[PDB]
């Protein structure tokens, strides 16, 4: 998933009017004679940033053959400050696209449900819903400790392909604050948190 194109021409045409960025409004725009508007064949990545350094306008772009992944294509794009490189994904039938999945109809990277599925007096099974590009989370950090004072909160990470976790070795009768941080690939920062309370 989700939107897929039968060819490079068709991918290019779609991303003239739909952003290539999940957060910003960045549309593909031709480099400023009689040659192909945007394909540059087997040309290197340093070179692609040479052809795009001289563009002031957002969305300047070419598509080159990929260096690190022969037979694949790369899409190079100017984003105000920097030159960004996209990998052109192919699916099972060899359709082309840029992003697996989609937002949730959501505008934030914070997990949206966080719930206790089942519980004993010394353990928790919890679940959550990441709807914003779940395929792009590298891992979740789960923290838990007594609500209020005092000691170190306990932490562990579960892989991004996971939607549930198990918390163990808890004291009966204690109120816990349970929190989850999403770490997208590759955001600089964890996403901001979502937490829950539960008393064993």
């Amino acid at each position: 998933g989700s939107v897929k194109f039968n060819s490079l021409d068709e991918l290019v045409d779609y991303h003239r009017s739909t952003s290539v960025s999940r957060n910003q409004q960045i549309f593909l725009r031709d480099i400023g004679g009689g040659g192909h508007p945007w394909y540059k064949g087997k040309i290197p990545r340093a070179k692609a940033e040479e052809m795009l350094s001289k563009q002031r306008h957002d969305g300047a772009f070419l598509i080159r053959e990929s260096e690190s992944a022969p037979g694949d294509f790369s899409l190079s794009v100017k984003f105000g400050n920097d030159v960004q490189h996209f990998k052109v994904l192919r699916d099972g039938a060899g359709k082309y696209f840029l992003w697996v999945g989609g937002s949730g109809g959501s505008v934030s990277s914070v997990p949206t449900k966080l719930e206790v599925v089942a519980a004993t007096p010394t353990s928790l099974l919890i679940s959550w819903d990441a709807i914003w590009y779940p395929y792009y989370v590298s891992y979740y950090r789960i923290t838990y400790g007594e609500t209020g004072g005092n000691s170190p909160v306990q932490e562990f990470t579960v892989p991004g392909y996971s939607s549930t976790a198990t918390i163990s070795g808890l004291s009966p009768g204690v109120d816990y604050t349970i929190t989850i941080y999403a770490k997208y690939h590759r955001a600089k920062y964890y996403s901001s948190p979502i937490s829950i309370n539960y008393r064993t």
Partner: peptide, 8 residues
């Protein structure tokens, strides 16, 4: 070798 739309 690193791309803006990579996977984990």
């Amino acid at each position: 070798h690193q791309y803006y739309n990579d996977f984990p």
